Amino acid sequence: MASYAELFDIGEDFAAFVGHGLATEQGAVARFRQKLESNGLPSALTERLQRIERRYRLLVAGEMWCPDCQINLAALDFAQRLQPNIELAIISKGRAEDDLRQRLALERIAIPLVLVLDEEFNLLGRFVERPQAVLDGGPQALAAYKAGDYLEHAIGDVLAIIEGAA
Numbered sequence: 001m002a003s004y005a006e007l008f009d010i011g012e013d014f015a016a017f018v019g020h021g022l023a024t025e026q027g028a029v030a031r032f033r034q035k036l037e038s039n040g041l042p043s044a045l046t047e048r049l050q051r052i053e054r055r056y057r058l059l060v061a062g063e064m065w066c067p068d069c070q071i072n073l074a075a076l077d078f079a080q081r082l083q084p085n086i087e088l089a090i091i092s093k094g095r096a097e098d099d100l101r102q103r104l105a106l107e108r109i110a111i112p113l114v115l116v117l118d119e120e121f122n123l124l125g126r127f128v129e130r131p132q133a134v135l136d137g138g139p140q141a142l143a144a145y146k147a148g149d150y151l152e153h154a155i156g157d158v159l160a161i162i163e164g165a166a
């Protein structure tokens with residue numbers, strides 16, 4: 001069983017992950033990123049992000065062909081660019097199936113799977129596939145989600161995990 005430190009160490013950074021995508025997938029990521037960058041974050045979110053003083057690691061299982069990865073990882077990368085204390089490293093879906101599924105008591109790996117770790121690699125919580133507001137909204141919210149209307153929420157969900165951990 002690889003440690004979280006070992007898995008984080010072999011994960012790719014976001015730029016390298018995007019760089020292995022098909023051009024169409026790279027374009028999708030660029031545009032979700034531009035949407036978040038032009039629309040900006042709500043001031044309360046910017047505040048929450050500014051309060052992160054300790055280092056946190058996001059161990060992510062994801063793939064560039066997955067729309068849910070394109071969307072939510074564009075958002076989480078934006079957060080790491082605004083707050084260097086947060087760092088993402090990305091491993092494959094297959095690797096999460098081989099080395100995380102049983103450890104996490106998951107039936108299958110739905111991507112992106114985002115494990116929020118502290119500086120000691122303690123597991124603080126998880127973001128799984130889509131933000132809570134999208135899960136809550138159901139089928140009728142998918143359209144707005146697939147269009148990027150819940151990018152800030154991916155960031156908010158991860159921040160709540162960090163904030164909830166005292």
Ligand SMILES: [Mg+2]
Pocket residue numbers: 013015016
């Ligand atoms: Mg690099």
